[PDB]
Design an enzyme around this catalytic site. Structure first.
Site, PDB file in Angstrom:
ATOM      1  N   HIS A 135     -14.630  12.810  34.338  1.00 40.66           N
ATOM      2  CA  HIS A 135     -14.082  12.219  35.635  1.00 40.66           C
ATOM      3  C   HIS A 135     -14.735  13.590  36.231  1.00 40.66           C
ATOM      4  O   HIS A 135     -14.230  14.363  36.249  1.00 40.66           O
ATOM      5  CB  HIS A 135     -12.748  12.165  35.516  1.00 40.66           C
ATOM      6  CG  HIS A 135     -12.356  10.648  35.454  1.00 40.66           C
ATOM      7  ND1 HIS A 135     -11.936   9.584  35.918  1.00 40.66           N
ATOM      8  CD2 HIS A 135     -12.009  10.164  33.968  1.00 40.66           C
ATOM      9  CE1 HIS A 135     -11.530   8.649  35.413  1.00 40.66           C
ATOM     10  NE2 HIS A 135     -11.710   8.820  34.076  1.00 40.66           N
ATOM     11  N   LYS A 216     -19.853   1.640  34.430  1.00 37.40           N
ATOM     12  CA  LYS A 216     -18.428   1.767  33.901  1.00 37.40           C
ATOM     13  C   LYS A 216     -17.767   0.438  34.243  1.00 37.40           C
ATOM     14  O   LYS A 216     -17.697   0.269  35.777  1.00 37.40           O
ATOM     15  CB  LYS A 216     -17.755   3.104  34.462  1.00 37.40           C
ATOM     16  CG  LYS A 216     -16.273   3.098  34.549  1.00 37.40           C
ATOM     17  CD  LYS A 216     -15.782   3.192  32.655  1.00 37.40           C
ATOM     18  CE  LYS A 216     -14.388   3.134  32.457  1.00 37.40           C
ATOM     19  NZ  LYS A 216     -13.729   4.586  33.145  1.00 37.40           N
ATOM     20  N   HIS A 245     -12.950  -0.237  30.225  1.00 40.51           N
ATOM     21  CA  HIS A 245     -11.566  -0.035  30.379  1.00 40.51           C
ATOM     22  C   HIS A 245     -11.022  -1.269  30.775  1.00 40.51           C
ATOM     23  O   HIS A 245     -11.327  -1.889  31.975  1.00 40.51           O
ATOM     24  CB  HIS A 245     -11.331   0.960  31.484  1.00 40.51           C
ATOM     25  CG  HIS A 245      -9.985   1.037  31.804  1.00 40.51           C
ATOM     26  ND1 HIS A 245      -9.336   2.357  32.325  1.00 40.51           N
ATOM     27  CD2 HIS A 245      -8.816   0.205  32.025  1.00 40.51           C
ATOM     28  CE1 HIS A 245      -7.923   2.151  32.533  1.00 40.51           C
ATOM     29  NE2 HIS A 245      -7.726   0.779  32.502  1.00 40.51           N
ATOM     30  N   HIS A 271     -11.036   4.818  25.245  1.00 43.52           N
ATOM     31  CA  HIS A 271      -9.385   4.921  24.977  1.00 43.52           C
ATOM     32  C   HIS A 271      -9.071   3.775  24.311  1.00 43.52           C
ATOM     33  O   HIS A 271      -8.052   3.153  24.796  1.00 43.52           O
ATOM     34  CB  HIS A 271      -8.532   5.421  26.017  1.00 43.52           C
ATOM     35  CG  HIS A 271      -8.838   4.724  27.440  1.00 43.52           C
ATOM     36  ND1 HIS A 271      -8.862   3.219  27.566  1.00 43.52           N
ATOM     37  CD2 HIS A 271      -9.377   5.073  28.649  1.00 43.52           C
ATOM     38  CE1 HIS A 271      -9.276   2.834  28.681  1.00 43.52           C
ATOM     39  NE2 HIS A 271      -9.670   4.245  29.432  1.00 43.52           N
ATOM     40  N   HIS A 319      -3.449   6.600  38.208  1.00 43.05           N
ATOM     41  CA  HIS A 319      -3.834   5.053  38.811  1.00 43.05           C
ATOM     42  C   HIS A 319      -3.330   4.746  40.188  1.00 43.05           C
ATOM     43  O   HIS A 319      -3.448   3.478  40.265  1.00 43.05           O
ATOM     44  CB  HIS A 319      -3.739   4.155  37.847  1.00 43.05           C
ATOM     45  CG  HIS A 319      -4.504   4.374  36.362  1.00 43.05           C
ATOM     46  ND1 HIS A 319      -5.693   4.144  36.389  1.00 43.05           N
ATOM     47  CD2 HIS A 319      -4.043   4.884  35.257  1.00 43.05           C
ATOM     48  CE1 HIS A 319      -6.081   4.709  35.074  1.00 43.05           C
ATOM     49  NE2 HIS A 319      -5.241   4.924  34.384  1.00 43.05           N
ATOM     50  N   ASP A 359     -11.161  12.434  29.269  1.00 42.27           N
ATOM     51  CA  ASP A 359     -10.833  11.646  30.110  1.00 42.27           C
ATOM     52  C   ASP A 359     -10.439  12.483  31.173  1.00 42.27           C
ATOM     53  O   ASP A 359      -9.330  12.661  31.821  1.00 42.27           O
ATOM     54  CB  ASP A 359      -9.682  10.610  29.758  1.00 42.27           C
ATOM     55  CG  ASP A 359      -9.381   9.433  30.508  1.00 42.27           C
ATOM     56  OD1 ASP A 359     -10.132   9.519  31.661  1.00 42.27           O
ATOM     57  OD2 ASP A 359      -8.656   8.525  30.310  1.00 42.27           O
TER      58      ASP A 359
HETATM   59 NI    NI Z   1      -9.802   4.317  31.714  1.00 44.04          NI
HETATM   60 NI    NI Z   2     -10.978   7.465  32.557  1.00 48.24          NI
END
Ligand code: NI
Ligand code: NI
Ligand code: NI
Ligand code: NI
Ligand code: NI
Ligand code: NI
Lengths: 566, 101, 100, 566, 566, 100
Positions: A135, A216, A245, A271, A319, A359
């Site tokens: 990121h 992504k 994701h 993940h 998040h 991550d």
């Molecule tokens: Ni993620």
């Molecule tokens: Ni991520």
């Protein structure tokens, strides 16, 4: 003439049959082969071998290597061997026996006046790590990752913005262009991911044509079947990779619905365990499919006493969830499960999970990908003993299985294995030199494209480079034009064709991704297991062929408090 | 022992030797203070200072370079001037000369 | 102060040593970086006091014992080297096997 | 008008006849001349001289200087005089009397609207130092050297690699190219040395054609008669300099054999005393020859109580020697001799040794070349009194003899004296401003090519630049394109002709070396002595004309504990 | 559906009617308008609104913005409103309602796949500050100013040289060129000022043609009527601005004489109060004229207990005055007056003084322009109550009056308001995001031309960006080529025409100044008062229409000890 | 904390002062940088306490005496200047001839 094996080991490093402990873990590696000719080893220093007419020849630059790493103990997916490494034109020239063919036998790596020497006797040399879940929250991450031994970073972002805090997405042509230009300033190879969440293919093609090497799909932007399908269609068209994701909320459907939307097309699941995001509570079942390349982010690696406790608040901040909103906390809690966290470790040991990633600053630690991978290996040996594929009294195979997780496998998954990922002839010379005592924790030297980019350095005014304080400082390989020549910016085939590099006036070397759609689980080196795995909907217990898969949390771990000041 | 100390030889320095000088009585008729620098063309100073401007033409204060003479409101005093050198071309100030002399 | 880069660099070592000093005070067994920092700072102060290089090469081996550090630490530090301004200028102090 | 000399000194700095103590040493300099006209000195500030129509004229930019250093006390090999310094187009325009010709007499340095002012009253101004024994182990060395007052760095290396740790060699075209590109990022003038150890001339010509301005012969790469001859032959061909670190082991022959191999050809002998390397124990006898330009590295300067003690381990680490190998320790010990170390100091005082250098992080301290040179001068005055060439009650000549050691002499030796090395008209404006109390220790301002590159700077948010903390920080002269315009990258005549600069896309100003083969001992300013020197093979005693040359070790030194925090 | 206003405020930030305290001051702002449609607000995060098909549409990059700041509380000279901000191509696209037109009503700012999101709910967003009194003493000032919220810096200098220490002048073509090249390395928009002190117009035209956007007249270089006239004549010709620091000594005449020399021509008076320089003791009377754009430097803002005490020595160091020279100290003391210092605060509150600036490291603090402006506002509300123009129970108008002082007014004064200065459509996206609790003290995000350039950042290796230590670190918008694309270098119309940018090879975006001669006091937003002001020659008392203008010194101030570590 | 560059810069001064403080405690005569750091830190803490600029300009001249520093040091420091956040904002404190 004869020499004792101990004296020999002290002088040129260990040889065939000798074992070495990796850092402070219980993992031991055994030298499988030695490519030298006893008595003809090359050593540099006053009154040593590498001197004019002796270990150094009379050949012109074109007929000799630029750099040679003497007496290195290589640890790679293909083997753990003792040999000299030759580097020429920023790439791996050969792995063999260095010296002067004029007076020495079996020389495959010629040393001449144009050759620089790096003494690797007693050191372990590995390929640079590849983190594919970055990121781009801040540029400082690059130096942190480089110091840990990671030389390639794939991800997305525009800086400390809400979107980037939660997702690995560089949204649109403008931002993609800006980040590509900014990449020239960072000492690591870089590849960008665009925002794949949209149901209009043209909106995706634009991003790929702009420069991204992948798309992504994140739930925060809507991981719906329609968006997933749209991204995969464009991916198949433009030969780029898709990272997923999934829909944790099960809002658009369950895991099986998402798997249905994917329709057997190649995809990289981020993940896969679930904590970092994904269909609650069974996203982990994805590792059973042939078209899925599964990876793990590092906070859950390995399962320890404090793992569960630290996750809730980490989840919320990343998040942008509100702890006062009941539904927000309920959805955070549904992602943290002791059952899946414990199973993940074992699945890695079995080769069901093929990659490890960070991550970075979004439920992951950028400088701990390599470190945590080895801690899992240690904990698994401690709990499960030797692997079935293990031969001899050593952990050679387990080591090969685990090193592949952050080197060759990430490279294969993102179509860059033709440039980096392992210590093989023709690949970019991204190498990391380690002292056995600090293996996987603190490297002695980090080489980017043939030049040392960063390394621990003592007092600048000292009479030697060793006096304290010794800390990591950037070297010549990380300076201006030298850096541009030693790093790679990965572009999509489309972007490369459209002349994006010339338009943006990118100064670094350019590399193109390819082979993203054809890679499958069977291609993951030492990690191709497709287990018959299930997850109990109520208890969350993970089972493979009906057997319960679980493990115990560690109270203390190696590569931790003995090495860090804080 | 004092790091970097000077050992200045005793005596004095004669400033602006061999140049024409003249003394003039100046009086500050303004209600605010006026300070004049060593190299300012005296004939073009603040109009509030009353003196023989004609005599001060092409002159400056005969004082150490970088220093000044201050005139408080109503203050009257005699100052010594020294003639300009070089091309003796005056440019700037109040724009009264803007040429040689 | 007109601090040069090297002086500022040494400030980093001094601070790292303060961290170790306080942990040793708590009765903790020091780790790798803590041990190196503590012994190094000791030598720098020795130089400030005016001790000779010869004296410090010996004294530096009695700052920490094997029982005050974590297992493996003594073997991770075959020697410690640091430079400081002695009354006669900058000199290098090398302490071999500082932890026994 | 009249003014007392003390008041005058406080206002414009000292004048003819006044003496000034250099830092906290016993060295005193006396102003020999003053180029001003008493009463017409230029001073800047509110209500001062440098103002429109007054000390500042009406000329266009082309008719006035860009920068003027007012009331500076110049200390250079040619004299110690009080004067104004004019800088135009990044070069020294004139040394004389600044001001406005319209109203001021004897103006040689015109000040106009396009002129910036640096107040140097009460300050000492010298030329930037030139260090010719740099090991490019890390880029941080450049800032350390710049802060000390060194503006030009000549050496070799590729980073913290074994070869560079021990030698000043940038091996081959690839590394040479990379380092030339990296040089653009450093705030100092740079010239590179290639690996001269080879018996095939073409292998050397390639390196010279690639960009190096000299070739380094080091024993670690084999300092044999064949290699030495080969390098000197190419040097004579391409007009580049050769630096030598001879065969300490006496393996290929003794000192006389090496001298025979050189055959009267011009060569620069590094660390001629021996500790840093060279025929044991008589390499020091080299200073008797006319074709030898001898220099000293700084750890042995000056001879002090702790000198011997610190050398053994320093030696071992630098040259990659094993303390467990008897022959390795024996050869280290043969290089450390109290006898030659003591004599070296005296030989410098007599002018037998012409240069001082560092040998950065390889048995030398990069930020201590200037500092240590003055400590030797101090210790020599203390022990030997006034020099025979000294006139008046001051140390003016000794000062001139010693300053030449790290300024003009290093420039002459490497063929760059046409660009730098002294405060002379036409040369690049690399100047260092010092406060008498901190002379040779901590400069007030470091100017690179007409722009301040680094200087001590206080609180950035403060109301003035003086509040604490005050520490060295890079200025505009060290920023991007400004830096490129204010620094020089030296190339060989061949490289310049082959268009190396355009090919590598070097952005800094380019300068070419010349006159490397024609320089001899007689050309070394104030340091041309060729003594009838001998060394006793058993006792190591140094004698000149039969007289024993020796000195006493210092217990305390100036420019030490009073100035540094650590 | 319904929701309480408190819950709403916690979720999307305050709305119409809600009040917010600015930091720890007594200033309260009230939301005047909200451009949203209740129920349709866009929010980013897991399971939020901005997702495919929902709050995010299917439009191509050209039909959507690159960046959106959601739920921002804008504070600008034109209003204090709640709205979404859209940024496209590095510029402000629109202020309104963001979302997806496919399913949402009133969408004016379209969000698509190419859109990045910055969550501004609960945050205050303002335009980047503009400091027009910068002394380029050191490059570090740029980062300090950027961190405070200032994105544009106008001034002059060449580094830590005597001339620059005292004046904002970049003397001549050579220095101007070097500084323009150096500017490319700094993360702020830059415009340079040349030395305007000369009576030959050609000497000025050269500087303007070289690149400066203005000319500085300073008394240290001679602020005589002849020089002032010459500069203003060239200014009228080339459309550039003139900044004035008048004759404090009253040497060439009194304030009225200087005003006469100006002859009604547009001019920007620096530190109009007097302490920073100007006709003693009545330079402050300049604010009564229509052609004068008056500003204040920050040390005197606001009047506090320690203000007077700290000024004498600050004054001396800056202007190179000698405390031993009676005339030097007398002239320093004549500049420090409690009377004028106290009045200045009130004059700002009344709008007689239109700008605030620093006077960086030359009697001013570079990181305290915004901070001190708000402290004055606070102290004025505390002492004078509500302004006559104030409506409602809030300080909305006072806030608008004060924010204009360091944003739009400085831009108008220097002819750059067409590019920056406020949050208006078409202007460069230089925005600063603040948390109400840290408003004006420490920003949450600083955006330069559409990219985050600097922001507080926590542990780089942490699992999230929030863990300690949190301190300001440069982001991608401040890196190499990205920086060049996000910053502006202002040039004079002449320089732009002569091709200066191409000649110097400037890499940043170029902008030209215009409208410098036509701006007058009446054009200063919320600060156009022309008071009938007088100053008593003996007592120094300031009076407007015969009324005494004064204020009380603060003992304690907000935005001080509660926020800073030192 | 959201530390700005200036706050971080001051941390350097504070640390330099800790070095001097401990050496003075040992009974050593302080050198140039040590003296400047010690007195400067003293003033910063004074500002934190809420003392006035006027008070500190005087108090700062009584932190170190000529007998607590090396020869020449007093003459090398004609004055010391440092800024800190007083209750009323940042102010400059100038201490003339701090060491007598
Ligand atoms: Ni993620
Ligand atoms: Ni991520
Ligand atoms: Ni050598
Ligand atoms: Ni060397
Ligand atoms: Ni001013
Ligand atoms: Ni100013």
């Amino acid at each position: 003439s004869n020499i004792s094996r101990q004296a020999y080991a002290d002088m040129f490093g260990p040889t065939v049959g000798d074992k070495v402990r990796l850092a402070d873990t219980e993992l031991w590696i055994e030298v499988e082969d030695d490519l030298t000719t006893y008595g003809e080893e090359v050593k540099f220093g006053g009154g040593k071998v590498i001197r004019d007419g002796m270990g150094q020849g009379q050949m012109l630059a074109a007929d000799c290597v630029d750099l040679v790493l003497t007496n290195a103990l290589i640890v790679d997916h293909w083997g753990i061997v003792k040999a000299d490494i030759g580097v020429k034109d920023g790439r791996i020239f050969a792995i063999g026996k260095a010296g002067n063919p004029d007076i020495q036998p079996n020389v495959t790596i010629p040393i001449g006046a144009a050759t620089e020497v790096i003494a690797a006797e007693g050191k372990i040399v590995t390929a640079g790590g590849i983190d594919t879940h970055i990121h781009w929250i801040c540029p400082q991450q690059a130096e942190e990752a480089l110091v840990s031994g990671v030389t390639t970073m794939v991800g997305g972002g525009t800086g400390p913005a809400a979107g980037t805090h939660a997702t690995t997405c560089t949204p649109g042509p403008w931002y993609i262009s800006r980040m590509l230009q900014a990449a020239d300033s960072l000492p690591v190879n870089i590849g960008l991911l665009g925002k794949g969440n949209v149901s209009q293919p043209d909106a995706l093609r634009e991003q790929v044509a702009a420069g991204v090497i992948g798309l992504k799909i994140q739930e925060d932007w809507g991981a719906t079947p329609a968006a997933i399908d749209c991204a995969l269609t464009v991916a198949d068209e433009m030969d780029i990779q898709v990272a997923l994701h999934s829909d944790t909320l099960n809002e658009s459907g369950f895991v099986e619905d998402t798997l249905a939307a994917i329709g057997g097309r190649t995809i990289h699941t981020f993940h896969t365990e679930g904590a970092g995001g994904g269909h609650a509570p069974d996203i982990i079942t994805a590792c059973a499919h042939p078209n899925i390349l599964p990876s793990s982010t590092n906070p859950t690696l390995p399962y320890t006493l404090n793992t569960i406790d630290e996750h809730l608040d980490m989840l919320m901040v990343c998040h942008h969830l509100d702890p006062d909103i009941a539904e927000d906390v309920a959805f955070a809690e549904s992602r943290i499960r002791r059952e899946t966290i414990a199973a993940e470790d074992v699945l890695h040991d079995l080769g069901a999970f093929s990659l490890t990633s960070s991550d970075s600053q979004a439920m992951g630690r950028v400088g701990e990908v390599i470190l945590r991978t080895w801690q899992v290996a240690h904990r698994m040996k401690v709990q499960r003993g030797a692997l079935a594929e293990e031969t001899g009294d050593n952990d050679n195979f387990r080591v090969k299985r685990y090193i592949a997780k952050y080197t060759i496998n990430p490279a294969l998954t993102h179509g860059i294995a033709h440039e980096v990922g392992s210590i093989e002839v023709g690949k970019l010379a991204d190498l990391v030199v380690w002292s056995p005592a600090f293996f996987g924790v603190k490297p002695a030297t980090v080489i980017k494209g043939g030049m040392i980019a960063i390394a621990p350095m003592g007092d600048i005014n000292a009479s030697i480079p060793t006096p304290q304080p010794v800390h990591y400082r950037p070297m010549f390989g990380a300076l201006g034009s030298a850096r541009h020549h030693c790093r790679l910016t990965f572009l999509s085939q489309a972007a490369a064709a459209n002349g994006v590099a010339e338009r943006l006036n990118l100064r670094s070397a350019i590399a193109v991704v390819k082979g993203c759609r054809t890679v499958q689980k069977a291609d993951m080196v030492h990690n191709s297991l497709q287990p018959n795995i299930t997850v109990d909907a109520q208890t969350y217990e993970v089972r493979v062929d009906g057997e319960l898969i679980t493990s115990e949390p560690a109270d203390v771990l190696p590569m931790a408090q003995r090495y860090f000041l804080f | 022992m004092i790091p970097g100390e000077y050992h200045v030889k005793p005596g004095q320095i004669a400033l602006n030797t061999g140049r024409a000088t003249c003394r003039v009585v100046v009086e500050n008729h303004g209600d605010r203070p006026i300070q004049v620098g060593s190299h300012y063309h005296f004939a073009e100073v603040n109009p509030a200072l009353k003196f023989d401007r004609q005599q001060a033409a092409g002159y400056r204060l005969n004082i150490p370079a970088g220093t000044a003479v201050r005139f408080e409101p109503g203050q009257k005093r005699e100052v010594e001037l020294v003639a300009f050198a070089g091309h003796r071309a005056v440019f700037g100030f109040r724009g009264e000369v803007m040429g040689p002399l | 102060m007109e601090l040069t880069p090297r002086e500022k660099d040494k400030l980093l070592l001094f601070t790292a040593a303060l961290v170790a000093e306080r942990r040793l005070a708590r009765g903790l067994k020091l780790n790798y970086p803590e041990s190196v920092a503590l012994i190094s700072a000791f030598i720098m102060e020795g130089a400030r006091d005016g001790k000779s290089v010869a004296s410090l090469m010996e004294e530096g081996r009695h700052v920490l014992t094997r029982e005050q550090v974590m297992e493996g630490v003594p073997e991770m530090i075959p020697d410690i080297q640091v430079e400081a301004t002695f009354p006669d200028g900058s000199k290098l102090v090398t302490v071999h096997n500082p932890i026994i």
